[PDB]
Design a binder for this molecule. Sequence first.
Ligand SMILES: OC[C@H]1O[C@@H](O)[C@H](O)[C@@H](O)[C@@H]1O
Ligand SMILES: [Cl-]
Ligand SMILES: [Cl-]
Ligand SMILES: [Cl-]
Ligand SMILES: [Cl-]
Ligand SMILES: [Cl-]
Ligand SMILES: [Cl-]
Length: 192
Amino acid sequence: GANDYVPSPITINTSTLPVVVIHTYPRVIGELTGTSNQYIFNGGSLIALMRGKFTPTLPKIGKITYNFRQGNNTQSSDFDIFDTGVPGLGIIIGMAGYWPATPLVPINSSSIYIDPVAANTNPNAYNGATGSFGARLYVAFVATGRLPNGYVTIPTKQLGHILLESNRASLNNKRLTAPVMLNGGRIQVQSL
Ligand SMILES: OC[C@H]1O[C@@H](O)[C@H](O)[C@@H](O)[C@@H]1O
Ligand SMILES: [Cl-]
Ligand SMILES: [Cl-]
Ligand SMILES: [Cl-]
Ligand SMILES: [Cl-]
Ligand SMILES: [Cl-]
Ligand SMILES: [Cl-]
């Protein structure tokens, strides 16, 4: 069908955080390996102008200034810290369009357009017409309080969802949504 786009998750893995070798709160304690999915929305037979609105759905504890080593931003920005549920550990999130020239968008509001970033100040801006919508995902872990030594399990958490919007009413009205996931895993703290 013309509008038969279907969602697919985009996921990033706790298991890629290096060992945290250790006091200031909050502070970033490492970055996960950034991930990407070219086909978060895909499958409709008629090309469309599309955009993705990200809404985080974990508790927001506060803000921290940061500049991802990954991505190409040269200035620090404010990021919302989201509660993993594990005491002392939060995450911050950036997202971007799929292709490398689009900028990392810090998640620091209730919702934001991750691509095109122009849509945050122009409600009629969309990606150029094509058959898919993808994105890049960046996450860093944040010490929000004192951490014990040793291994810690992080549960799998849904960080939020991307809503597909379009200037084609029939596609926009479907309110297709795709999950943005933190795959759980183990981290290790070494307190010397
Ligand atoms: O840049 C807009 C879109 O271009 C397409 O060619 C890519 O497959 C999508 O991942 C991307 O969202
Ligand atoms: Cl993915
Ligand atoms: Cl990975
Ligand atoms: Cl992909
Ligand atoms: Cl950044
Ligand atoms: Cl969850
Ligand atoms: Cl229309």
